[PDB]
Design a binder for this molecule. Structure first.
Ligand SMILES: Cc1noc(C)c1-c1ccc2nc(-c3cnn(CC(C)(C)O)c3)nc(N3CCOC[C@@H]3c3ccccc3)c2c1
Length: 128
């Protein structure tokens, strides 16, 4: 089998912006998560071929990972902080769909998501 093409990290027709919130997401939120003990499985797309995962890309049609989100923040791909926050949420949700509650990968995701939500509370309250 084959993996699909990864999600785009640049698009020459999509308008770009840097906001205070998008900056905080790169400089504070992603940085914290990236260095965490349980980050590594989320630092790049799920290689479903190499991990031999049954029907992964048949169940997960909107894949997402921190590797992608990191390059997207670095390339000023997003217009809004909400676009980025929904990428984080997609990634967690995906994990909780494909994997059994309480399995190791889910406990890792749950720890990252708790840390995510703590740092999302510190966001500048207005996007400028
Ligand atoms: C699936 C899935 N859904 O959301 C995410 C995120 C995943 C995901 C992503 C990457 C993964 N990478 C591995 C992995 C890559 N190398 N190794 C080390 C070694 C010695 C080859 O086993 C383990 N291993 C992974 N899983 C695959 C499924 O079962 C558990 C196994 C795992 C999880 C955590 C630690 C070790 C192994 C996993 C999983």
């Amino acid at each position: 089998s084959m993996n699909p093409p990864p999600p785009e990290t640049s698009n020459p027709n999509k308008p770009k912006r840097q906001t205070n919130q998008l900056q905080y997401l790169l400089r504070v939120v992603l940085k914290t998560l990236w260095k965490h003990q349980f980050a590594w499985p989320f630092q790049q797309p799920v290689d479903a071929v190499k991990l031999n995962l049954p029907d992964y890309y048949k169940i997960i049609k909107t894949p997402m990972d921190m590797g992608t989100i990191k390059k997207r923040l670095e390339n000023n791909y997003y217009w809004n902080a909400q676009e980025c926050i929904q990428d984080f949420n997609t990634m967690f949700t995906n994990c909780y769909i494909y994997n059994k509650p309480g399995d190791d990968i889910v406990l890792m995701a749950e720890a990252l998501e708790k840390l995510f939500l703590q740092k999302i509370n510190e966001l500048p309250t207005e996007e400028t």
